[PDB]
Amino acid sequence: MITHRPRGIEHPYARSLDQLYPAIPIAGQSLTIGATTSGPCSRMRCFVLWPEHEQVFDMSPVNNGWQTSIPHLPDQDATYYFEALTLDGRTETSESFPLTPSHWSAEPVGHIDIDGDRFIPDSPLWLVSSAGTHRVKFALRIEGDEHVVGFGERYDQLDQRGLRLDSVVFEQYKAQGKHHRTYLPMPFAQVVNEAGRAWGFHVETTRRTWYDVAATVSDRILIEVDLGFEATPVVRVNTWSGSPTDVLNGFLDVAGRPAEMPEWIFGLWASGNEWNTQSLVMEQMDRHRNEGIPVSVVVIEAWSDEEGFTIFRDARYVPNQGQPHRGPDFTYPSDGAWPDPAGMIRELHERGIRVILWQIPLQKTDDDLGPEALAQGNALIASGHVVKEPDGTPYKNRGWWFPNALMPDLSTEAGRQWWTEQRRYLVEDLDIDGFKTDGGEHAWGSDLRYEDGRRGDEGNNLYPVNYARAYGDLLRSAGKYPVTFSRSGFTGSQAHGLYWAGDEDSTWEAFRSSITAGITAGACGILYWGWDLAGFSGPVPEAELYARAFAAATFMPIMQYHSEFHHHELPLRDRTPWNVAEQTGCGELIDLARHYTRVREALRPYLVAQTRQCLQTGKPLMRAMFYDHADDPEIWAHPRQYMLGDELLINPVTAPGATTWTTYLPEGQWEDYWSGEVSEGGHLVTRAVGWDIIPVYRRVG
């Protein structure tokens, strides 16, 4: 048969072979039409039936894909279908499809609800067709000396002026900066002038938005907003003006504010994907203690049966028909991977170490799953708490990873409770302290259905927020702090846990991007941010990168090292200070880790006090220079320096081979953190940078 889906697979940055391009066709522009056949064919034609006449396009094979294209789409409603000739001589015919071309209209088709003096009253254009209103474009005025920071966590640069981007939740495996994508976008930005005054805007939607930040038109920010699948709309844009902090507070009052967290989150976080047994985890905790490099948190990723992510590997039990288990249902074999996980957690707590387990908002369904995982999947479907396709069948994951897995519907309270109740015993009986809520970007399709009533056009970006919220609610209900550790998010994520910068290679450029990611995230209200120090993918980072990264991480909200799965092959890829030292031949790394972890400990009373102030003032912890020094234009030339709370200025050494590093100090007096040497602000200072130094300056109070 012939397959054609006008919107295709709905990958946000890629087209499939069986769709229209653009998906919402526009009169006057080219339209590419694609289709696939299940079997091999010799010919394939596309018939387009306009009101007054017909047209036949003889399609060409592409890479069983077929394609044709119309150079200049006429502004008329039509009908189209495909016809193929199979190799054995059969004529195959598709269903009929509608083609309602849109055009941009300056009529008051809808209303943009917005205040402030930057909105250009005549700029609104509505993309309309006989079928509805699909998107809207409007413009905001920007002045010559203005800088634009926001749109969530960004990996390319601090100031987004001169760039074109969008806000859509997406999984970009590595090189996020190079591709200009992110796991945690937000349709919001603050605009700051060189006199220190600011304004900001928030498009109040969870649908996709695009931004042309004075890239095409030098004095205009062009904003494009998706209006969704059920196409007289009202688009609400919140605005604020005042100091940079007033603008961020305005947004947080609508989005939500960071939650309170326990002190233990500020110690060193240890993690390694290949720690897949109780002995492997404990071997590393024993080495931390033996080397005098204390950890406060251990994250275990490869802890479960790798099928349902609900039960420790090798645990024995009477299987369930998809209902939740309790602590006592499990017997752990002494020769197994986890002989006494309760005992591990108990011993680690006595040593002052908390435990965090990995999760994914997906339920595998494939070929070789055991009866427990298949049952758990069928009970999920049967409960009805699953994201569904338009036809009411369960949504099957369209990504290459976890192919065809189901997605729990975490949009309603009942849905969240059904998924998290399966994990309650981990918190209540085994006593774990939190979860690494990885993923959340798997929902593609504007016509998916959620139990909250929203369709995919709205629910897909909202998904990671609901996901983090679900686990935070579980933890709260079990008497604990809502410590979730996530990578994806959207507006509203501010109120749900902690965040890390995602997956990257062990490179200098990635280190530079990570800094930008943290600062830009802080600027959108993501307070508790961390990253995989020195990168988690590929061969271990060279000694110098590890050293510089470890030092930088020491002066960031969440200090954490992690390593990617590598099939337990040689050589060992853990990002432990000892493994990196072994592999690189640089013994000093262990002393450096000791040195900075000692500094981290001495810094914990400061981090705790500054976090209290951040919650009261609304300011970030990992803080861009403009929050406190916006009346000083020179800050913009040093976008990778940042404040850590009110008192410390941090400037990570991000180049290989540097023996000195230059830092720009704003007005006031500054004190060298390591030597006590006092410098006068308002100029550049050069600091010698042996590996046991990262330029840090404290305001003289």
Ligand SMILES: [Ca+2]
């Ligand atoms: Ca108008």
Ligand SMILES: [Ca+2]
């Ligand atoms: Ca049972």
Ligand SMILES: [Ca+2]
């Ligand atoms: Ca004991």
Ligand SMILES: [Ca+2]
């Ligand atoms: Ca992962």
Ligand SMILES: [Ca+2]
């Ligand atoms: Ca590499």
Ligand SMILES: [Ca+2]
């Ligand atoms: Ca308060």
